[PDB]
Design a protein around this ligand. Structure first.
Ligand SMILES: *[C@@H]1O[C@H](CO)[C@@H](O)[C@H](O)[C@H]1NC(C)=O
Ligand SMILES: *[C@@H]1O[C@H](CO)[C@@H](O)[C@H](O)[C@H]1NC(C)=O
Ligand SMILES: *[C@@H]1O[C@H](CO)[C@@H](O)[C@H](O)[C@H]1NC(C)=O
Ligand SMILES: *[C@@H]1O[C@H](CO)[C@@H](O)[C@H](O)[C@H]1NC(C)=O
Ligand SMILES: *[C@@H]1O[C@H](CO)[C@@H](O)[C@H](O)[C@H]1NC(C)=O
Ligand SMILES: *[C@@H]1O[C@H](CO)[C@@H](O)[C@H](O)[C@H]1NC(C)=O
Ligand SMILES: *[C@@H]1O[C@H](CO)[C@@H](O)[C@H](O)[C@H]1NC(C)=O
Ligand SMILES: *[C@@H]1O[C@H](CO)[C@@H](O)[C@H](O)[C@H]1NC(C)=O
Ligand SMILES: *[C@@H]1O[C@H](CO)[C@@H](O)[C@H](O)[C@H]1NC(C)=O
Lengths: 227, 49, 291, 48
């Protein structure tokens, strides 16, 4: 259980709208730049908070699923995503895990899609107003400490209209876990509509100046930012 | 350059003001017309106006 | 002046499934007030006309939308909450209402948008079983938040003395059952109540009314209705590279300038129809009337 | 203590919220008591 710098990772398209060559300001739950992310080389149950940023880099496909919920028992509903070499299945049944699940009962929603999963895989899980939103991205990386310094946005992988209660989560078997805070970001959409860069308006005075000027470049002078 | 920038900025602000709600339920007049009957649409339309 | 539109086009997807309003409304036993049954409605054609074939309802009160406009709107998702209440309490099912049912059993948001439908149920819920045993919560420490269900059977401790889970003095049982009888007057008759809550905008629309999809017209000033997105303009082929999850595009001013067709899955650029000022050039009327 | 005297069906407050009462200071209070018919209770309101 170590700590690592998140750099600029953890940026996702906040909405379905298309924009080209724009600097757009969005207030939403994001992973702050250069934040501390927990690093696991193994998987204890972790709190969920507002949202979760997840990163994996294994080549053996050891990481094969996530569990979300409050009690993680049959007392309350527990979201369960399991990926296998062919597909990815999602359920909201009440489970009694023991270590797949010893017992399952009272299923409400089920879903099947293409499997979610060096080849770094990044995910963002949010649970807001009865919607579970999953954003995902897969990028080629090289060997190193982890979480390279490049920039890549996370496209919306899936949305689930399940009004469940989530406060904790756990993974199923070197992965990185970070948390999301309500931040205002300045995203850059290039000519093709791809988010190529972003500014975290609360990172430092320079980023606040950039957000106030709605630009990535600041001319010499003194600028009156927030009070 | 300052004159040109001031004119462009004023026009951009004037156009951006069409996205505000001003206390209405929506900033699009067609949505108000297609979602509400006249007696209830009048309040929202006046708030936009 | 302004170029007037020539045609009107509606573009809805191939979704033809009828929304399961039948099972929601034509259910043998509705749940109690404190345990109102909520169902999700999505990915179907919401034909509200069939609702008129299920009951001559005495209440069809809609907030934020007109009842006659429902067949021409697209919704992202719908919540259907069903229960059985007393008639005189039906008025409590509304935003900004204070009462036992409104605050302790079922609460609506201030910004609630949707409809409420209540109809008679004396002929079907005056019998035994749960029909005569319809219950509701009477006491609670604090008012329920909007869209919240509390089915706990905790004993309400009115006094300071602890109850230890046993009903007694100042230790009441909040879950009180109705006494619905056919002999009661209109002030105590049971009514079945269904509340529809719609969610508009944001997510792509998947619940739409029974509106036919017409042909696609390009390079002409027309009215367009793309999955509830209403507008007027000229549709052309566009070179914009929409990502697979993206539906419509906006400019710097945040005005919709591109749209993905629900059926053909192509990207159409939208340009407002031509307009401008008209000027009359004239010598003085003392000279001539030509302009 | 008012909650220990009756399970009242009406606690309608104008210009103040019922839950905020314990955190407010008042200069003076008038308490007007009577007995009415139930259907007429709604008539006890401003602009009625
Ligand atoms: C990350 O943690 C280390 C030690 O726990 C601390 O020194 C460092 O300041 C933290 N980084 C941030 C950005 O808070
Ligand atoms: C979710 O669960 C937590 C504890 O398990 C509880 O405190 C919270 O009130 C619950 N929220 C909802 C909306 O059920
Ligand atoms: C993966 O899991 C799904 C879910 O049951 C199953 O249908 C599929 O056959 C599995 N794939 C393999 C290769 O076993
Ligand atoms: C499953 O759901 C039903 C319906 O609410 C309930 O009666 C039953 O107790 C549930 N199962 C368990 C093990 O509690
Ligand atoms: C990484 O994985 C993604 C999806 O599994 C794939 O599209 C991409 O080509 C992979 N990258 C490399 C370098 O193989
Ligand atoms: C945008 O896409 C076009 C073709 O899809 C490509 O030629 C161009 O290089 C791209 N621009 C950028 C900045 O990636
Ligand atoms: C409900 O369905 C039953 C059989 O499906 C039918 O006999 C009855 O008339 C229906 N009632 C209403 C109100 O639709
Ligand atoms: C809808 O049906 C038409 C009829 O053939 C077909 O051409 C079109 O591809 C379909 N589109 C979708 C999104 O199903
Ligand atoms: C009123 O006071 C009498 C005696 O002082 C007591 O027996 C009775 O319970 C009280 N009633 C209420 C509603 O406080």
């Amino acid at each position: 259980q170590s700590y690592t710098n998140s750099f600029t990772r953890g940026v996702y398209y906040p909405d379905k709208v298309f924009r080209s060559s724009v600097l757009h300001s969005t207030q939403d739950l994001f992973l702050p730049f250069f934040s501390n992310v927990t690093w696991f080389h193994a998987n204890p149950v972790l709190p969920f908070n507002d949202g979760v940023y997840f990163a994996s880099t294994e080549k053996f496909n050891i990481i094969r699923g996530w569990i979300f919920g409050t009690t993680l028992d049959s007392k309350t509903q527990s979201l369960l995503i399991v990926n296998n070499a062919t597909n990815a299945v999602i359920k909201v049944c009440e489970f009694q895990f023991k270590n797949v699940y010893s017992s399952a009962n009272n299923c409400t929603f089920e879903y099947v899609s293409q499997p979610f999963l060096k080849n770094l895989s990044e995910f963002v899980f949010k649970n807001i107003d009865g919607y579970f939103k999953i954003y995902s991205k897969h990028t080629p990386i090289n060997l190193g400490r982890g979480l390279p310094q490049g920039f890549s946005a996370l496209e919306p992988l899936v949305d689930l209209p399940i009004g469940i209660n989530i406060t904790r989560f756990q993974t199923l078997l070197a992965y990185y876990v970070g948390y999301l805070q309500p931040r205002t970001f300045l995203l850059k959409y290039n000519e093709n509509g791809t988010i190529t860069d972003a500014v975290d308006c609360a990172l430092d005075p320079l980023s606040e100046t950039k957000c106030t000027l709605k630009s990535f470049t600041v001319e010499k002078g003194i600028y009156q930012t927030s009070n | 350059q300052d004159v040109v920038n001031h004119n462009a900025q004023a026009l951009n602000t004037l156009v951006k003001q069409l996205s505000s709600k001003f206390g209405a339920i929506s900033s699009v007049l067609n949505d108000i017309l297609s979602r509400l009957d006249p007696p209830e649409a009048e309040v929202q339309i006046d708030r936009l106006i | 002046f302004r170029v007037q539109p020539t045609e009107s086009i509606v573009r809805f997807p191939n979704i033809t499934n009828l929304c399961p309003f039948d099972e929601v409304f034509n259910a043998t036993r509705f749940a109690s007030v404190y345990a109102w049954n909520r169902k999700r409605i999505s990915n179907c054609v919401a034909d509200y006309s069939v609702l008129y074939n299920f009951a001559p309802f005495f209440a069809f009160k809609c907030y934020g939308v007109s009842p006659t406009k429902l067949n021409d709107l697209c919704f992202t998702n719908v919540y259907a909450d069903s229960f059985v209440i007393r008639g005189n309490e039906v008025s409590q099912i509304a935003p900004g209402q204070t009462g036992t049912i409104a605050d302790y059993n079922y609460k609506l948001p201030d910004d609630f948008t949707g409809c409420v439908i209540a109809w008679n149920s004396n002929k079907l819920d005056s019998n035994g079983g749960g029909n005569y045993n319809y219950m509701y919560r009477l006491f609670r420490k604090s008012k329920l938040k909007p869209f919240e269900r509390d089915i706990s059977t905790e004993i309400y401790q009115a006094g300071n003395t602890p109850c230890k889970g046993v009903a007694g003095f100042n230790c009441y049982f909040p879950l009180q059952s109705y006494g619905f009888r056919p002999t009661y007057g209109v002030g105590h008759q049971p009514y079945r109540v269904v509340v529809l809550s719609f969610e508009l905008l944001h997510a792509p629309a998947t619940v739409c009314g029974p509106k036919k999809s017409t042909n696609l017209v390009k390079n002409k000033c027309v009215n367009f209705n793309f999955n509830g997105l209403t507008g007027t303009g000229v549709l052309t082929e566009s070179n914009k590279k929409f990502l697979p999850f993206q539906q419509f595009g906006r400019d710097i001013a945040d005005t919709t300038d591109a749209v993905r067709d629900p059926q053909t899955l192509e990207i159409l650029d939208i340009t407002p129809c031509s307009f401008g000022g008209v000027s009359v050039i004239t010598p003085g009327t003392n000279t001539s009337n030509q302009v």
